[PDB]
Design a binder for this molecule. Sequence first.
Ligand SMILES: CC[C@H](N)C(=O)N[C@@H]1C(=O)N2[C@@H](CC[C@@H]1CO)CC[C@H]2C(=O)NC(c1ccccc1)c1ccccc1
Ligand SMILES: CC[C@H](N)C(=O)N[C@@H]1C(=O)N2[C@@H](CC[C@@H]1CO)CC[C@H]2C(=O)NC(c1ccccc1)c1ccccc1
Ligand SMILES: CC[C@H](N)C(=O)N[C@@H]1C(=O)N2[C@@H](CC[C@@H]1CO)CC[C@H]2C(=O)NC(c1ccccc1)c1ccccc1
Ligand SMILES: CC[C@H](N)C(=O)N[C@@H]1C(=O)N2[C@@H](CC[C@@H]1CO)CC[C@H]2C(=O)NC(c1ccccc1)c1ccccc1
Ligand SMILES: [Zn+2]
Ligand SMILES: [Zn+2]
Lengths: 100, 101
Amino acid sequence: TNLPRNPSMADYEARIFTFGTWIYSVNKEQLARAGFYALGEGDKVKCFHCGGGLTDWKPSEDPWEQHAKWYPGCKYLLEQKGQEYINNIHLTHSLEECLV
Amino acid sequence: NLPRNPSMADYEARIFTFGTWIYSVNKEQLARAGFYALGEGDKVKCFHCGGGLTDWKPSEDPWEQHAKWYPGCKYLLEQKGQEYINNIHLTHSLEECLVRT
Ligand SMILES: CC[C@H](N)C(=O)N[C@@H]1C(=O)N2[C@@H](CC[C@@H]1CO)CC[C@H]2C(=O)NC(c1ccccc1)c1ccccc1
Ligand SMILES: CC[C@H](N)C(=O)N[C@@H]1C(=O)N2[C@@H](CC[C@@H]1CO)CC[C@H]2C(=O)NC(c1ccccc1)c1ccccc1
Ligand SMILES: CC[C@H](N)C(=O)N[C@@H]1C(=O)N2[C@@H](CC[C@@H]1CO)CC[C@H]2C(=O)NC(c1ccccc1)c1ccccc1
Ligand SMILES: CC[C@H](N)C(=O)N[C@@H]1C(=O)N2[C@@H](CC[C@@H]1CO)CC[C@H]2C(=O)NC(c1ccccc1)c1ccccc1
Ligand SMILES: [Zn+2]
Ligand SMILES: [Zn+2]
């Protein structure tokens, strides 16, 4: 805090290379853009800036949404997407949750 | 189209009307949120949607109230975005569910 926790993967171009073998439903450019790079096992990816790791992407799911869902403290996220967006995902999620 | 009252379409004119304000709610915020005071009581009104607001309690934030009551306002939207507005209206919704339960 507060610099990239993986400065080697800072450049989007760098991150996109790491997806050579990529074969999963979720779009690699999205992931790359969202901050993530592939780890080299299953569908596991990790954010370049906060170092958060996601896994088991379902077919509809959006990179930017999960990033905010799971690691909403990421400063890359905040810079690229702003605070109110983050508040949004959680709110939506919390409301649905309560509605069951 | 959508302007509404271009005579109060700027901060300085808006804050003037508070040259005599007495109530809890801050005078510089109301202004930034697009409101001028009328004259009667604590009655205040937006400039771009003509939203009226009165009975300001001691905990209510102008922008929240602008979105709670007049969410369509094109000025609001172009100050705080779809997200902020919806976030105000998704959370009163949450409150209700949380006290059903
Ligand atoms: C960012 C990598 C860093 N090494 C780290 O903290 N990883 C984890 C982490 O941030 N989270 C994982 C939990 C164990 C780790 C704590 O060291 C799960 C996701 C995240 C986390 O704790 N998320 C919380 C949360 C909630 C509000 C603000 C910030 C974080 C969380 C909990 C439930 C649902 C969504 C988010
Ligand atoms: C990304 C969409 C997917 N459907 C999803 O919601 N994934 C979540 C997820 O990856 N994590 C959340 C757990 C519920 C989900 C499991 O599907 C919390 C964080 C992450 C996770 O399971 N593992 C992380 C991690 C981080 C810190 C401690 C333990 C686990 C992780 C870390 C490195 C590499 C891969 C995952
Ligand atoms: C701008 C002044 C002051 N910080 C405030 O009242 N902010 C609002 C706020 O926190 N929330 C309102 C939206 C307008 C502001 C967001 O910047 C409604 C949602 C609320 C909020 O507390 N969101 C939380 C949250 C916590 C639990 C469940 C769901 C949502 C939030 C969640 C994750 C990460 C950061 C905040
Ligand atoms: C933000 C102040 C206070 N907490 C509040 O929200 N009051 C409400 C309110 O002003 N309005 C909401 C109605 C419930 C409240 C009445 O106590 C809907 C929109 C607004 C409104 O209709 N204001 C009127 C008004 C006039 C007299 C009595 C009550 C409401 C209004 C119309 C034009 C100019 C000023 C106020
Ligand atoms: Zn991140
Ligand atoms: Zn308005």
